[PDB]
């Protein structure tokens, strides 16, 4: 039990530590700027859209090479729940709220990305096979 609590403390520390990330900020938009984020960037693994405090949070969709939109899983982060993290890096996105639509473009798309060798969202934490069997 002692090593488990120590492991949990170290895991929280490593998740919070946040070293060695590059940030893409070459994001552009066209469409209905009323539902637009104030900031968009990515860290190579997730894509973040910051919305202001007086803005409704829209729905964000994955646009593929042919124009088709599809669902992407979503996390809402930030102290005031103002950031939407989608779990993918993509060259094109679509933001929809009601009948308003906004296109987001990744103007610095990196097809290679950075591999996920650990199983987690951070390179400093590893997901290990507990179940044995």
């Amino acid at each position: 039990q002692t090593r488990e609590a120590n492991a949990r403390a170290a895991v929280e520390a490593a998740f919070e530590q946040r070293v060695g990330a590059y940030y893409n900020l070459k994001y552009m938009m066209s469409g209905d700027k009323d539902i637009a984020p104030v900031n968009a960037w990515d860290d190579g693994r997730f894509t973040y859209f910051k919305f202001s405090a007086n803005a409704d949070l829209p729905s964000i969709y994955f646009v593929d090479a042919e124009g088709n939109e599809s669902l992407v899983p979503r996390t809402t982060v930030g102290s005031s729940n103002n950031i939407i993290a989608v779990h993918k890096v993509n060259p094109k996105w679509m933001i929809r709220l009601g009948n308003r639509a906004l296109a987001i473009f990744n103007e610095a798309y990196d097809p290679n990305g950075v591999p996920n060798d650990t199983g987690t969202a951070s390179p400093a934490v590893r997901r290990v096979n507990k179940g044995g069997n």
Binding site: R8, A14, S70, N129
Partner: protein, 131 residues
Amino acid sequence: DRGSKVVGFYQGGLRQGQARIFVQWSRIETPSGVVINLDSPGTGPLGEAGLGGWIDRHFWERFGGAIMISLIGDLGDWASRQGSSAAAEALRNSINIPPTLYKNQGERVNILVARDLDFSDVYSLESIPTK
């Protein structure tokens, strides 16, 4: 993980006017050996219920017997008059043929998770020592 094999099934076929089949995804197997029973609905790429593709409504199988019966009867009447109902039974017997859906390989689909999936017994987290 990516590349995990999800296995599901459908049954019952379509009805007239329907263009999507309910597919239930039953189990997923992770590349590292983790297996979880998700009994979830299969949806399209934007989460609309069922898998939908190209529909074969079997027009000729449903109506060609009646059409041909009518045409034979009319041509026979033309010939007989030029000397100087079976159609309804065929339709009654072959009108209720349900459609068939064809969906190509390699298309995108979704699984909308219907229940909470718990992975506490098969994974654990350890911090990676630096340097």
